[PDB]
Structures are given as structure tokens and as C-alpha cells.
Design a protein around this ligand. Structure first.
Ligand code: ZN
Ligand code: ZN
Ligand code: ZN
Length: 127
């Protein structure tokens, strides 16, 4: 679901979607450690998107990656500029467009909101 070079914060610092392993820890919606309990392989040929955010950061995700918005969970293919990514000043999505397919990968974490922080801006996203 996210491009492999997407940086993700960790209790020790930073990793990437390409490097993070089951049993590692990411950061949950409150910034506390949250365990990775499942993943996907690296997946090829999925339709990819760039999501640009108001904090000056951007994340490449596939069409079906899920995002927590004020309207509820939306997949990337349904994001619209103006929406925000929230955990319950929320960062705003400023643009969404298709981009050529790159390798992507998803992970699942075990906090009750099923959210982890992603990108250099530490934006909330859904597993
Ligand atoms: Zn840092
Ligand atoms: Zn699509
Ligand atoms: Zn994921």
C-alpha cells in the first residue's frame, strides 16, 4: 500500500516501508510505540498516487491504501483536496494525482485505532 522509500518513525528513530519487519514497532496515533503484527510482500504493478499535504510533505500510496479522514476512512482513490487526515492542527490534503506504478507494501499494527504515522511529517494513516 505505501511506496518502499516512504519513511516511517519508530521508537528508535526512522525506518522505511521497505525495511520495517513484523515485530518491529512504529508510532501510533498518540506517538507511542505500536507493534507491527502482519505485512504484505512487496507488490508490483498496483496503481499508484502521490498525496500532497499542507505540512509540505508527500506520500506515494496505492489506490486502495486507507486514510482516516473527517468523513471516515477513505481509500487513496477517493481522497480529495480539502480533506484532512485525523486521529479522532490536523494536516490537510492539498492535492492527489496518479503517478507511475512503484513497488508498495502494507503493514498492520495492533493499537485499537489501527493507525500509524507515516512520512517525514508523521501523518496518521490506516493499516
Ligand atoms: Zn525525528
Ligand atoms: Zn485506481
Ligand atoms: Zn499499511
Amino acid at each position: 500500500a505505501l511506496a518502499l522509500d516512504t519513511p516511517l518513525p519508530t521508537p528508535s528513530g526512522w525506518t522505511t516501508m521497505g525495511d520495517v519487519a513484523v515485530g518491529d514497532h512504529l508510532l501510533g496515533p498518540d506517538g507511542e510505540p505500536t507493534r507491527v503484527v502482519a505485512d504484505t510482500d512487496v507488490m508490483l504493478g498496483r496503481p499508484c498516487y502521490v498525496v500532497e499535504f499542507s505540512d509540505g510533505t508527500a506520500i506515494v500510496a496505492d489506490a486502495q491504501h486507507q486514510w482516516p479522514t473527517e468523513h471516515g476512512v477513505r481509500i487513496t482513490a477517493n481522497l480529495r483536496a480539502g480533506m484532512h487526515t485525523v486521529v479522532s492542527p490536523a494536516v490537510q490534503i492539498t492535492a492527489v494525482r496518479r503517478r507511475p506504478s512503484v513497488p508498495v507494501r502494507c503493514v498492520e499494527v495492533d493499537n485499537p485505532e489501527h493507525l500509524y504515522l507515516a512520512g517525514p511529517g508523521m501523518v496518521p494513516t490506516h493499516n
